[PDB]
Design a protein around this ligand. Structure first.
Ligand SMILES: Cc1cc2nc3c(=O)[nH]c(=O)nc-3n(C[C@H](O)[C@H](O)[C@H](O)COP(=O)(O)OP(=O)(O)OC[C@H]3O[C@@H](n4cnc5c(N)ncnc54)[C@H](O)[C@@H]3O)c2cc1C
Length: 260
């Protein structure tokens, strides 16, 4: 059974028939930076581990670890994981890594989180990271999904941040949220690549145009989504970097392959 690096589910919350979030106890010695991912999983029928990469959806200070997950019909992990219940366990490898970290960027004045689908997961972490509002004056969350229902987890998160009297102040008109659908009717629509290139996002939010001097960005989507967004960023004069030589943006795959 689930014994290796076992942690315990403390809460579960379903959002759509393809999306759910959950939280589990944190390993005692685990330390990470907001944005990083880890390996989790469950045993298959024969007792073999089914391991998968997951961004930690909670910020570094949170006492429990949060995850925002797809539900793949017939997906080896999530076909099983979607039916997880409080009190049940999961395997968790306490080896955080990744390049969606503030340290992997040149310091600047504005920070952009550019995501689609479950790619908002590392930004559910980072948007709740103190350092994000310390090192930057403005934090822009662009989230693009096909439907209004897929935006809800993210929408509730940002609502909680903007309303809470304490955080609401600490995040003093710094956090800007721009959700869009690409298929379903919604007050705000369009692909991140198009809304960034056209300059429409700037008019809607009422913000200064993208500037390589000051703007820094993180991209988390399908490989296809990362490619297109890289181009638009580079058109603005921003260059890809990392911990080795930090520049103005970083990208990570929300998953491998084509996507649900
Ligand atoms: C760096 C990294 C971070 C990741 N973070 C998350 C995360 O926080 N939340 C999460 O749900 N998944 C995340 N993924 C994907 C995750 O590792 C698994 O692929 C996922 O749990 C589904 O596993 P499965 O075995 O059920 O399906 P798989 O056998 O892994 O894949 C089945 C198919 O479903 C599609 N798919 C898989 N994951 C997604 C996704 N998240 N969104 C849309 N389509 C998908 C792909 O087309 C894939 O071909 C991440 C992947 C990487 C590489």
């Amino acid at each position: 059974k689930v014994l290796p690096d076992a942690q315990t589910v403390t809460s579960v919350r379903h959002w759509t028939d393809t999306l759910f979030s959950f939280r589990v106890t944190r390993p005692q010695t685990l330390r990470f930076r907001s944005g990083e991912f880890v390996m989790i999983g469950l045993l298959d029928d024969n007792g073999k581990p089914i391991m998968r990469a997951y961004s930690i959806a909670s910020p570094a200070w949170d006492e429990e670890l949060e995850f925002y997950s797809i539900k793949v019909p017939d997906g080896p992990l999530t076909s099983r994981l979607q039916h997880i219940k409080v009190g049940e366990q999961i395997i968790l490898r306490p080896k955080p890594v990744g390049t969606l970290v503030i340290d992997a960027l040149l310091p600047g004045k504005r920070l952009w989180f550019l995501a689609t689908g479950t790619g908002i997961a590392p930004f559910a972490s980072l948007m709740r990271e103190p350092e994000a509002y310390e090192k930057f004056d403005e934090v822009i969350m662009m989230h693009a999904c096909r439907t209004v229902a897929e935006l809800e987890y993210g929408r509730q998160l940002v609502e909680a941040l903007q309303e809470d009297p304490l955080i609401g102040e600490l995040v003093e008109g710094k956090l800007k949220y721009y959700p869009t659908t690409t298929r379903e009717e919604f007050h705000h629509m369009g692909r991140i690549t198009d809304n960034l290139a056209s300059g429409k996002v700037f008019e809607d939010l009422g913000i200064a145009p993208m500037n390589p001097e000051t703007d820094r960005a993180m991209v988390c989507g399908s490989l296809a989504f990362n490619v297109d967004v890289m181009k638009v960023l580079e058109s603005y004069g921003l260059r890809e970097g990392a911990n080795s030589e930090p520049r103005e943006f970083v990208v990570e795959k929300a998953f491998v392959g084509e996507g649900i």
